[PDB]
Amino acid sequence: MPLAELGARLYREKACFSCHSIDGSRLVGPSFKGLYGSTRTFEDGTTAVADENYLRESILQPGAKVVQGYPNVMPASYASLSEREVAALIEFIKQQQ
Numbered sequence: 001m002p003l004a005e006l007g008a009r010l011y012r013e014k015a016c017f018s019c020h021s022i023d024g025s026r027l028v029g030p031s032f033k034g035l036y037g038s039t040r041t042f043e044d045g046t047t048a049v050a051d052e053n054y055l056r057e058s059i060l061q062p063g064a065k066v067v068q069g070y071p072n073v074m075p076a077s078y079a080s081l082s083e084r085e086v087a088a089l090i091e092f093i094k095q096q097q
């Protein structure tokens with residue numbers, strides 16, 4: 001199955017939808033709309049661009065860098081996602097623009 005399609009399925013099955021919208025609305029977490037390639041500011045005032053590595057780090061190392069003005073509640077369980085699943089989720093995120 002193509003990665004974007006698997007990533008849409010994982011967005012649902014892995015519960016991302018519960019905290020992250022794809023229509024620009026703020027839920028518990030930030031929307032994925034426009035996320036890839038945007039600049040992020042963290043709780044410490046540092047910034048970074050949301051590139052592939054940042055998305056990967058955000059999913060696989062939850063809680064390591066936290067977007068300012070959000071609670072630090074990314075699930076632990078995603079540290080166990082497989083390489084295909086991470087790649088799929090990222091492909092799905094990149095196309096939310």
Ligand code: HEC
Nearest residue numbers: 014015016019028029030040055058065066067070071074
């Ligand atoms: C609520 C209990 C969450 C669930 C379920 C998922 N995420 Fe999350 N995420 C959440 C918050 C509150 C935040 C912001 C604080 C922080 O840790 O930075 C995030 C952040 C991310 C990011 C970075 C987003 C940005 O705007 O820079 C990514 C890429 C991300 N989250 C991905 C993600 C995926 C793919 C999830 C399902 C596997 C998922 N999150 C679930 C809260 C919650």
